[PDB]
């Protein structure tokens, strides 16, 4: 891997709303374009936001998303 903190460089940018986390409006976007391999066939719209962050808060911050980035790989 290039850098372990390579995850902070993405989510935070897709946080173009100003809420600390992403409503799927900002997530479905982060998955497509930069993280296609995951949102490229499986894990569709409601299958990535609810798949790993829906503990019941219609939102996905960076640390809920934390392991998210690690889930996008081994």
Swiss-Prot record:
Looking at the record, the residues that make up the EF-hand domain are: 10-43, 40-74
The residues that hold Ca(2+) 1 are 21, 26
For Ca(2+) 2, which residues are the binding ones? 53, 55, 57, 59, 64
Cite a GO CC annotation. basolateral plasma membrane
Answer whether the UniProt record assigns the keyword Acetylation to this protein.
Answer: yes
Q: Which InterPro entries match?
A: EF-hand-dom_pair, EF_Hand_1_Ca_BS, EF_hand_dom, S100/CaBP7/8-like_CS, S100_Ca-bd_sub
Q: What residues bear Phosphoserine in this entry?
A: 37
Q: Which UniProt keywords apply?
A: Acetylation, Calcium, Metal-binding, Phosphoprotein, Repeat, Vitamin D
User: Out of the domains of life, which is the source?
Assistant: Eukaryota
Q: Which GO terms describe its molecular function?
A: calcium ion binding; calcium-dependent protein binding; vitamin D binding
Q: One Pfam annotation, family name? A: S_100
Q: What is this protein called?
A: Protein S100-G
- What species does this protein belong to? Bos taurus (Bovine)
